[PDB]
Amino acid sequence: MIREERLLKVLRAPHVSEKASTAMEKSNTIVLKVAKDATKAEIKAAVQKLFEVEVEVVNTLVVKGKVKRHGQRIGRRSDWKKAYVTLKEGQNLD
């Protein structure tokens, strides 16, 4: 099974946006920015064992990184994996 170490390493942070808020309010789906190599089963098992929720299924994607210009210098701030964790009905959470 998934060990607790990896289970904890999976999730990085929640997400804050207008799409994030409208999703969590309407379709009962949270959004989590997660470590770039964590899979669907890992994300689902981790949100379950960590938030005491029942999750339906996770839709995940990799937002592509942006190129920024500091002075004359060009750089690539990362890409990262953004997961739409669609909770099961009736579940509330802090």
Interface ranges with RNA (CB under 7 A): 15-20, 23, 27, 29, 31, 37, 39-41, 56-57, 59-64, 66-69, 81-82, 84, 86
**Residue among 43, 79, 39 at smallest CA distance from 30:** 43
CA angle at 57 for the pair 13 and 24, rounded to the nearest 5°: 55
By beta-carbon proximity to Mg ion, the closer residue of 6 and 40 is 6
To the nearest whole angstrom, how small is the minimum distance from the Cβ of residue 69 to Mg ion? 8
Name which position in 6, 19, 36, 88 contacts Mg ion (CB under 5 A): 6
- Which of RNA, Mg ion, none binds 1 (CB below 5-8 Å, type-dependent)? none
By beta-carbon proximity to RNA, the closer residue of 8 and 63 is 63
Q: 3-state DSSP call for residue 91?
A: coil
Quick one: three-class SS letters along 71-90?
A: CCEEEECCCEEEEEEEECCC
Using CA atoms, how far apart are residues 26 and 70, in angstroms rounded to an integer? 39
- Which of RNA, Mg ion, none binds 54 (CB below 5-8 Å, type-dependent)? none
